[PDB]
Amino acid sequence: SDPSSINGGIVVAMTGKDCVAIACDLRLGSQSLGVSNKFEKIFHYGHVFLGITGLATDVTTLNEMFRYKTNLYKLKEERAIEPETFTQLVSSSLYERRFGPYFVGPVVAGINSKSGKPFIAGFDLIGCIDEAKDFIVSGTASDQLFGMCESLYEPNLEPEDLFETISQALLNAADRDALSGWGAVVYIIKKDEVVKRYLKMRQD
Amino acid sequence: TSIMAVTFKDGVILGADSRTTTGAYIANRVTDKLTRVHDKIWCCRSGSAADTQAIADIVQYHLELYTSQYGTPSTETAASVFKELCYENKDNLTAGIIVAGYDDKNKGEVYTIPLGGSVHKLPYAIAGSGSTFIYGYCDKNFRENMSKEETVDFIKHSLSQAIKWDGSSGGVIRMVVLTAAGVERLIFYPDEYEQL
Amino acid sequence: TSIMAVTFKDGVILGADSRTTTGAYIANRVTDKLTRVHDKIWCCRSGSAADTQAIADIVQYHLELYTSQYGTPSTETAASVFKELCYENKDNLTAGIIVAGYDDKNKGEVYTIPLGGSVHKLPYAIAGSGSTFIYGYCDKNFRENMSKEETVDFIKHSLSQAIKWDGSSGGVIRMVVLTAAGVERLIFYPDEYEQL
Amino acid sequence: TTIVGVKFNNGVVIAADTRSTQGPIVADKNCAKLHRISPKIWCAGAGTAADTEAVTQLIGSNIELHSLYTSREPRVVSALQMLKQHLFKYQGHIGAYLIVAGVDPTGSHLFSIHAHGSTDVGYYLSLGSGSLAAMAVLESHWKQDLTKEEAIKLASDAIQAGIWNDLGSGSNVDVCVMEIGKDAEYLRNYLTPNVREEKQKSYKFPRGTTAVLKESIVNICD
Amino acid sequence: QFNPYGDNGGTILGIAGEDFAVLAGDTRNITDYSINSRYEPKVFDCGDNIVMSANGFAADGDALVKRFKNSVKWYHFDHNDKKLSINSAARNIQHLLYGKRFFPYYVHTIIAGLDEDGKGAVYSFDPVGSYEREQCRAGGAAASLIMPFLDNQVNFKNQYEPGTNGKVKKPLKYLSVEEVIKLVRDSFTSATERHIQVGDGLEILIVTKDGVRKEFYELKRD
Amino acid sequence: TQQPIVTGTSVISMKYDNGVIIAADNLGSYGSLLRFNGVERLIPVGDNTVVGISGDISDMQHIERLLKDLVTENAYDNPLADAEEALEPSYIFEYLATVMYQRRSKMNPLWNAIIVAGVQSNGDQFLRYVNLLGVTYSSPTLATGFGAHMANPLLRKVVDRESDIPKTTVQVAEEAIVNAMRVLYYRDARSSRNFSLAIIDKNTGLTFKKNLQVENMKWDFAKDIKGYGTQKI
Amino acid sequence: MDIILGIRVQDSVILASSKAVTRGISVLKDSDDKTRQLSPHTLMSFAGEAGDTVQFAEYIQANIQLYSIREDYELSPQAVSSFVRQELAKSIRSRRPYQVNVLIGGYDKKKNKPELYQIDYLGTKVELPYGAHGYSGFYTFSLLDHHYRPDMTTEEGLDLLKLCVQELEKRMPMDFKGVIVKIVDKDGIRQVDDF
Amino acid sequence: MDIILGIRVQDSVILASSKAVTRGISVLKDSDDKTRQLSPHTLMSFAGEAGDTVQFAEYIQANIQLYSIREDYELSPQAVSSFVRQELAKSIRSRRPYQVNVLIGGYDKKKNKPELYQIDYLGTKVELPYGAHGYSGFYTFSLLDHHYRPDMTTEEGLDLLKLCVQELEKRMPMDFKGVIVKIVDKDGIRQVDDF
Amino acid sequence: CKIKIAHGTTTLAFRFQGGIIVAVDSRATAGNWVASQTVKAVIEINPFLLGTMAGGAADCQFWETWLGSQCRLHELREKERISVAAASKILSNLVYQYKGAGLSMGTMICGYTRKEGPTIYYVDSDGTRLKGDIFCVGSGQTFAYGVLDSNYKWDLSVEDALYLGKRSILAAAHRDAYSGGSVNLYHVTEDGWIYHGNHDVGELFWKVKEEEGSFNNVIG
């Protein structure tokens, strides 16, 4: 009965030279029982990408909630929301439920369309922002991801090289966690193109 | 904490140590537990630092508003406002407060307010963890209508012993003198009071 | 309980109240908490009545057997036997004992033994629930090499205050004088000590 | 966390480490614990990271509206009062432990606030897990009539004590100097004594190392 | 109520080569958020070319190593100075650990050395004695950080041959002592960055047919 | 299963170029009550070792008796009891470390934290810690209780690593220890002003200093502190 | 309430739901239909806490039927499932949550595709080729992993379903008194009377 | 372990005992014989805590077989039951008691009478015309109160027993996978293979 | 609070026309942490006897190697290989002495002798001892049962039986989070046990998916 580790899952995000990458596993389970192997945890609103780990009902709810809010934002602002601004929106919304929180570990990733700067950020369940130059990790294999990223990561990686690094970080971390894995997805994000790759990984 | 207030010939004197603790760690060694709720109505704070401050802030507000409408409040009135807060919120408060004030009619008065929120008007009052160690001493040594210098010595010797035996009390001995003359702050350092 | 033992010029004096309680009921108002473990080695008992009696009975037995083989035991020896029992059975005992005795070589000696079973040799010692209220008083008023009459007054005034403030202490003030002259029992009734 | 505050001649300085933890795991190696309430009132925060940020922003927001309403520069005691009453109302559940400092028309000020709403006044203060390591340094080296450069040195040394000796604190030292009559200078990463050494090996993978099942272009445009 | 266990933190790492084996471990010893020692070795030469470490609760770790060292001594007395093989040592340790099955040694034990064919060997144990020979094992507080990195770099897990459509795996090969130490040093610098209980210093014990060599490296002290 | 009754607070210590220093205040606390003031918590064993003990005093007095008995036992049938076969710090420590761990293993611990400071026969400095759990460790500076949190940071500014030991004199080392004791008096609620200090040097031997006091304290700034926020008077 | 299964095949969705209702040491009923028709081409089976199950199912049924009348239009299985999920997602943070797990089997007439949604009491929705709630899944999932193919017929799906029930009847501790099987396709909802 | 029944008729004792062995959510076995032959004309069925049941049954079996060899004589069902009761009566105040309930069905050759003893894990012995342990009794006792007669034959007893099993299969929550039935009479012990 | 010790492995063994198949996975877990993927959950007691391990790793590893010593002592004393019944009962009587102490074991003693023929005995830590044709034990036992039971016949060939055992573990390895790593196969005949290799799930899953056309739930 620990909400953050019932369903399982992981998300990781990295920066590179004029690019960002965000990746997640596909598992959704009920404790030991693996239920779904198609449960994607990365969503996007315009050019801003959001990954969410934790309790699956809240992952779904928050996606729907941020789609709701970014749609109204765009109608009133007459422009797409930027990663820096969206990060603040996520933080506001999570802290609004301070004493009855969504049991989640969200991760923002994207490139600011005006400045062109790569941007990533992470949060705890009550909305504390964790900004980073290098990488953000989240989920039931966060310890594993921290260890992989801290050793494998180097700055200013090209999109093609960055893909290999983030993928290897996710895969090997997932393989040491029982509640993570069952497939994986990686988003490579350049200024005006986004490539989505499904990884081949062990299915146990 | 170790705190006390003592009435005497010319008025009343409040006394306190300066120790604030978190478990066995001293979070503040120079605390000021003697606080003003009105010109010549002060209080000694013991118990929760947060609770006693919140209470003292509210009382100051009430007495400031009282003064704007009805002029200077009595020391009894101040004690009643403290009581009302302590009694009605007894379930959520840890505050042992001594109220002390100087009227011109009533001279020096001391009201003590323990955990329950009861009010007790006394010639002198002691409170706080370290007061337990000086009930015997204070009862034997207190006299009514003492002089200023005698009362200062009585408070200094008493709190010196309270500090000596109570680990939850220490630092400097702060005192506040309330008379017709005005308000006087006194401080006494370890090098003096320890070797009494 | 309120108990104390005080060394002085001619030897040592033990002092105690006479109250035994079950919760708030006074099971015995004329208890004798000063007990003989040897001719001129006595103890003050505080804590569990059953434990302290059982302990004192065993110590008396040990010292009687010691005397048959090796002659009169020292006050230190008596304290060590008390310690050995209190320390080794610390988990099952509630006993705060003060050991006091008169040697001709060592004169008056006082050893206090708190709950843990540690030994502390002191000029004077206080213990029991009511001792908390007289740490301040006793520290300020104790002097070494007092006379018999001064020590009796010091104990009487101290236990009077302990009794006054502690609900768990009361009744008569028993005392036992240990000197070269011999053993003298003293008693003091409420009508005398209350109005000190 | 380790956070400190030190008063000096013509103002006040506060400092903080930059470690953020999640259990035994270092989540952020360079987080900002120094918060701007108003231009010349700054706040060092320890405890629940979301709470310190949220409570500082809320009071900072209300302080700005109050400053505009009264046509006056905000005072530290206003921020102090608003913070403590907010925290007290929540009976400690908002786990924010703050060192509030700044300059205003009244002068220079230094306070601390605890989660339950109790405030303390002082010339030198320290809060957080490494407050004992810091306070040890402050108690050993603090004196009356410190200069600007001496107070910065003392403050950063108190943070360093936390960085090295407390496992809860680490990485860098942030400083903010608030002098009277001058603009407050926020010195982000004032010291960086924990630089990561060169790695022994590059872990750049040969391209094609990772096995892929599918590729697809994602549509971000309308 | 009295709690007989404690957590002294730290982390250990064992890698096996073709004709050698390394057993590394940081030198930091902690309790709660305090550092007890910056240099307290927990990787020990036990004789017969066997190095051992029992990470977790140090009192239990020391007791175990002490008992095994003593087991080696009596093995010589009772069996005509016969060399205790690494496989025999492992089985003996299982019985030491399981002997306290119902009041366990709170430790993750790793031993390293050479097998009877002269090839590198690493064995790892759980707290109650279940053991297994492996090429690779991390243990302790930062095991969860280091281990997946070792799967990737030592056993080439999830790495395929470029251009082979993820069909041909990267071939397994033994690593040189130089390449292994590079991985150890990087594993510990990474673990030091992200785990608060890991740091101060790194001590590696290398085991070849010639004997037991030592190497020491500084780690971040925050 | 125990609960400590009469307790002793911090014991602090450090190494210097020729030997080791150790210190501990003279207080026997009974909870919040500062009950006993004449308690010696540094116990010398021979002329080359000092054992500093914190925690339960009844258990401390038991450990005293064990060490006292150890000296007696070592002298038996030992012509070189005051020479080559005298008790070393390492011997005394290992014995205690054995006892402490055996007692915790029987779920009946000696509720103490112990620091054995001394100088070996070959001149080497010895300083090692052991506690109720049987946990042992060594470091250029060692401290128990609040000392661990407040003293160690200050002492590590003097001797941060091994290479700083030859560079640290006995004057500099003692100054840091005495300073640390002052800081503990400021900030530890179960500490006293009166303390004992011991120096074990390889040249000058054992110097035991009793009845020391914390002095040169800063309290003057307290007078300027008024209220808890707004209050001006 | 215990066993509810679901299998999506080429052209239909098949739901199987146990018939037993047990309270204490007594099987009170052995012919219970643990499902409600939400709309002509959408069926919802349910299992969980006593009372909550039927109360929740009928509440959803009333809402979907209200929508159908108002718009003179049938909601898509995807739309119904999202509505149901949101109701459970609200529920879980209520004073007393609905402890109900559901399967929603429907046929989308616009896409001409069968759809099976599995939603737990927390509001955790997943579209699946085959689904189950409770302990049933611990046997049926691995069985279907092996025997299921995406292009199967309704008749092949029923044989695949018989294989699940047999396995459950063999290895489950409790007697669940067989199952009521219902099929959802382009022609609506119908019950298999002989199973 | 769950269902054990016993019916004493005119000339025999009939014991019925469930075949299922269940651990967690898995029926590990469906052909388990929950009985041991203590002597040629004495049979004991058992049910209770896992492990304890078989360990206790075999321990008793060993003791009775030891007695038979020593004296070259068969103990009476009354004597065996008293021995068993005393062992359980000792057990209940031990450090770890046997949590086992037994039925002892035997034919006394000296009296030429069948005898059925019901003994619980506390050592509570009663001679009965019909007996049961666990939740079984809550159905079977009232059923037998109605249908049982003292002068019934073995064949009538088996039909009476079939009536009990049917009722249990209808109203019991758990699948106990049928029963193994054994008859004890003047000719010894034999198993009914088709039930 | 309490320490996490290695637990696991999913094991099965079924009797059939051509002897006994025994299949197990190789994963050990400490909570959600995957501790090992290379655990030997089959003990080779002797050329005719096997023992499967599930539950506490140490408990199983320690007591089954101990069991092997007791079986060796039997054949030294009695000049004859121990029966599967006797071997299993030594283990079951041992754990019964530790009943309540907290041992966690789910084992299966598989082997062949002349008097018994192929025999499988389930033995667990709460004292249960059962002879039987089919058993699945471990956290992923139900997943293995689902595939095994639905495809089991007595008249399976050695080739088909070996595969069904392998496929059943794979099924559990896939669905059960606490099962995986690799499959270890064994075939027990009248001549003794025969090892049929270590099969990594990493390659085996995709090989089985492609060739068999199963696992359509997974993104191909």
Ligand SMILES: *[C@@](C)(CO)[C@](*)(O)[C@H](CC(C)C)NC(=O)[C@H](Cc1ccccc1)NC(=O)[C@H](CC(C)C)NC(=O)[C@H](CCc1ccccc1)NC(=O)CN1CCOCC1
């Ligand atoms: C003497 C010391 C005893 O009566 C005095 O009365 C002084 C009075 C002055 C300071 C006004 N009392 C205190 O110093 C007071 C003692 C105390 C402690 C706990 C409850 C009531 C009274 N100290 C405090 O209030 C400190 C002040 C902070 C450290 C600046 N606060 C705490 O200890 C907080 C308060 C929690 C609380 C409990 C119940 C009612 C209100 C508030 N406690 C903690 O932070 C707990 N801490 C967590 C980490 O582990 C150690 C304990």
Ligand SMILES: *[C@@](C)(CO)[C@](*)(O)[C@H](CC(C)C)NC(=O)[C@H](Cc1ccccc1)NC(=O)[C@H](CC(C)C)NC(=O)[C@H](CCc1ccccc1)NC(=O)CN1CCOCC1
């Ligand atoms: C003062 C009073 C306290 O410091 C003195 O120390 C004296 C010592 C004298 C008598 C030598 N102490 C007592 O009078 C002592 C108080 C006490 C109570 C419990 C534990 C420790 C100390 N009183 C007693 O020992 C009485 C004496 C009887 C009435 C003759 N005994 C009890 O109160 C017993 C004690 C049982 C016990 C508990 C823990 C350790 C040892 C013994 N308690 C009861 O009878 C409980 N009682 C049942 C009726 O409902 C009210 C509670």
Ligand SMILES: *[C@@](C)(CO)[C@](*)(O)[C@H](CC(C)C)NC(=O)[C@H](Cc1ccccc1)NC(=O)[C@H](CC(C)C)NC(=O)[C@H](CCc1ccccc1)NC(=O)CN1CCOCC1
């Ligand atoms: C020193 C470093 C330690 O005290 C400083 O005090 C810093 C303060 C800086 C960061 C402002 N303190 C922390 O970093 C603080 C320590 C802490 C942790 C938990 C409770 C209280 C204090 N760390 C945090 O607040 C982290 C911030 C992360 C890095 C973004 N937050 C968490 O660890 C959250 C705690 C959430 C929380 C909920 C309810 C009450 C209090 C806090 N914890 C998690 O996210 C863990 N968990 C993982 C799975 O998802 C669900 C939650």
Ligand SMILES: [Cl-]
């Ligand atoms: Cl205060």
Ligand SMILES: [Cl-]
């Ligand atoms: Cl008495």
Ligand SMILES: [Mg+2]
């Ligand atoms: Mg009285």
Ligand SMILES: [Mg+2]
């Ligand atoms: Mg640090």
Ligand SMILES: [Mg+2]
């Ligand atoms: Mg799996």
